[PDB]
Write an enzyme that holds these catalytic residues in place. Structure first.
Site, PDB file in Angstrom:
ATOM      1  N   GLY A 109       0.712  -1.265   0.033  1.00 36.54           N
ATOM      2  CA  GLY A 109       0.169   0.018  -0.075  1.00 36.54           C
ATOM      3  C   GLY A 109       0.781   1.256   0.152  1.00 36.54           C
ATOM      4  O   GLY A 109       0.632   2.298  -0.645  1.00 36.54           O
ATOM      5  N   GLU A 134       2.163  -8.151  -1.953  1.00 36.91           N
ATOM      6  CA  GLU A 134       1.094  -8.673  -1.657  1.00 36.91           C
ATOM      7  C   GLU A 134       1.170 -10.268  -1.666  1.00 36.91           C
ATOM      8  O   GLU A 134       0.713 -10.772  -0.891  1.00 36.91           O
ATOM      9  CB  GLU A 134       0.187  -8.263  -2.718  1.00 36.91           C
ATOM     10  CG  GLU A 134      -0.477  -7.033  -2.198  1.00 36.91           C
ATOM     11  CD  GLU A 134       0.255  -5.765  -2.847  1.00 36.91           C
ATOM     12  OE1 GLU A 134       1.504  -5.903  -2.688  1.00 36.91           O
ATOM     13  OE2 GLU A 134      -0.103  -4.926  -3.019  1.00 36.91           O
TER      14      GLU A 134
END
Ligand SMILES: [Zn+2]
Ligand SMILES: [Zn+2]
Ligand SMILES: [Zn+2]
Ligand SMILES: [Zn+2]
Ligand SMILES: [Zn+2]
Ligand SMILES: [Zn+2]
Ligand SMILES: [Zn+2]
Ligand SMILES: [Zn+2]
Ligand SMILES: [Zn+2]
Lengths: 254, 254, 254
Positions: A109, A134
């Site tokens: 993020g 991720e």
């Protein structure tokens, strides 16, 4: 400006500093305050550029707050994901000149915010790594973020980095083009100002039209199917098998 | 496993070795056995990755067998081309982690298999060159293979390489990003295993979704017009002028 | 051949030399004569390649003639812009092998011609810079030219260069991939001939199909909305605020 999770400071340059310790996680509160504040800056005709950075050196942003998406109801997930899309859409399509003074580690993020900027400057601290990891969390970067990454370091590099969830330290990030510049930590903010000054020599209207021109396709690919993207995140995140690994990953975080 | 034209050997790693001397040409038999065997490996839950290589050092693969497409009936061409597409589709979209241990020259067709892999390792043998030299044969790489190339070394480099039919030796292939690594010949297989081990540290489901995400557009571009692609190959290949240069090229191969 | 604004000279290689001093501006006359002449060369079966260059060293081409688009009627703008599109479409989609012997500064419009070539060679003169600096003029590169740039130096580099209107000197242009080669000024033309000779070793039909294959998508993106692109240029250029900065920019040119 709420100046709670994000401090907005200050010719024609404003600074937005992440203030959500311990790791500047992207909580819903944070995502919401960021967009609202960003909007005030955009409608403030005296502000032409914005430098993004952590008020606390060490961690730029750890990205999404896994807790915001564990054991929650579908309506929350839908609301949450919509806020993540919003954050990306507003930054990626901002008419302001955005510069990331990356003064800390910037995984997942955190990396998305940096990827939405017009220029990325990183502190020459071997402990700071940036990238979309991720896959390691049992998660996967959303298609639009993936396209943003592809547009940055190339399709081939992105294919490897995203699958291996690679986190690049300074020198490596520079080599792959993830960051545009690497300077000693204490010079990051001043360099951001130097570069910013240069972008200001560019007539605003033509710079903005050019930028808009470069990114509409990428953004539009998300905007035309936004609801579907939200439904997919909700489905995928709600799966018991994925909800599970979201626990084992959180527990290992103790 | 037929283990005739392709040997399948063997924790979680299987090796597929081209066994179709003299030049591991991509005959219809070969293309067919490869896909069938690849499928067994994919449904074998104990196999997570696959290393591709020639059982005989010197030539990775010479690519398509020109004979398979000279003086044949349209129905054959249609059948043939469908098998070539199949080979590309199954490799490009494979959920397995694919690694090419390029231990020989790898022109045209051989290069396509390598391009479909998740990682490419090449032997530091100056005699080994890899690339799509179709143009020299009076032929042209199919649009989908072209997109795969573009996604690998960039649009500009691909534009030059495809038109000039460039064949890159080790150092050059590495420089353009066609291969990801170059090691001394005797280390190629062991390196493939090293790298493979690393990819195995990545949770399978998220790696696979990421990969799928990176390649669906490219693959889908072919899948939606597969029949048309087959018709075009049949038309183009059936032209007397092209059938002709397909003879002068074969004769010069004596 | 009119041989007025562009001289056409001359085995299988023709040279087109810009002859529109002081700065080889892309006037409507020039744009028109160029296309007409280019067409004769394309239908001349004895011509296989074309080298583009300025007959006068120093300035390859300054690009569009701002005067052609100041205080004019909409019908003229429509006609003008159509001629600019034409110039790009004919060069970008040419079946001839095009090589730019960049022997002078090549900003904006001049850079578009170079970007349409199959190979770019530049004189090692620190005074010569190439790039799309429209943004500085209060203007913006058309979407199709932008895609051509993206296909050349990558999306990320293009995003920065177009917004900052960056003009790269020799070494920098080579580093970013804007040019393929940099040689001492006096060798530019001979090198263009050397390289050209190599491209000639490639069978014409397959080279042309490959090229066509690489560029149709980009070109088609313009062809399908050509009228709309013309309407947009006319609207944008006709705006009093833009017409204005088109005066202050011209006056500063005195
Ligand atoms: Zn909620
Ligand atoms: Zn500071
Ligand atoms: Zn300070
Ligand atoms: Zn048959
Ligand atoms: Zn071995
Ligand atoms: Zn062995
Ligand atoms: Zn007129
Ligand atoms: Zn000369
Ligand atoms: Zn001369």
């Amino acid at each position: 400006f709420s100046n709670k999770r994000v401090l907005v400071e200050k010719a024609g340059i404003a600074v937005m500093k992440f203030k959500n310790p311990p790791v500047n996680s992207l909580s819903l509160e944070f995502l919401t305050e960021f967009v609202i504040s960003l909007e005030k800056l955009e409608n403030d005709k005296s502000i032409r550029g914005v430098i993004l950075t952590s008020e606390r050196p060490g961690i730029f942003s750890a990205g999404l707050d896994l807790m915001e998406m564990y054991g929650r109801n579908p309506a929350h997930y839908a609301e949450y994901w919509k806020a993540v899309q919003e954050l990306w859409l507003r930054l990626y399509l901002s008419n302001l000149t955005l510069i990331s003074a990356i003064n800390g580690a910037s995984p997942a993020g955190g990396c998305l915010m940096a990827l939405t900027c017009d220029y990325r400057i990183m502190a020459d601290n071997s402990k700071y790594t940036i990238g979309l990891n991720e896959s390691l969390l049992g998660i996967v970067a959303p298609f639009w973020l993936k396209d943003n990454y592809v547009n940055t370091i190339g399709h081939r590099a992105a294919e490897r980095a995203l699958q291996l969830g690679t986190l690049f330290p300074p020198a490596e990030a520079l080599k792959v083009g993830l960051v545009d510049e690497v300077v000693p930590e204490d010079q990051v903010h001043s360099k951001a100002r130097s570069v910013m000054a240069k972008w200001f020599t560019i007539p605003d209207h033509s710079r903005q039209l050019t930028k808009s021109m470069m990114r509409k396709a990428t953004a539009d690919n998300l905007i035309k199917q936004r609801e579907a993207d939200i439904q997919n995140f909700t489905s995928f995140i709600s799966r018991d098998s994925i909800q599970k690994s979201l626990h084992v990953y959180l527990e290992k975080l103790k």
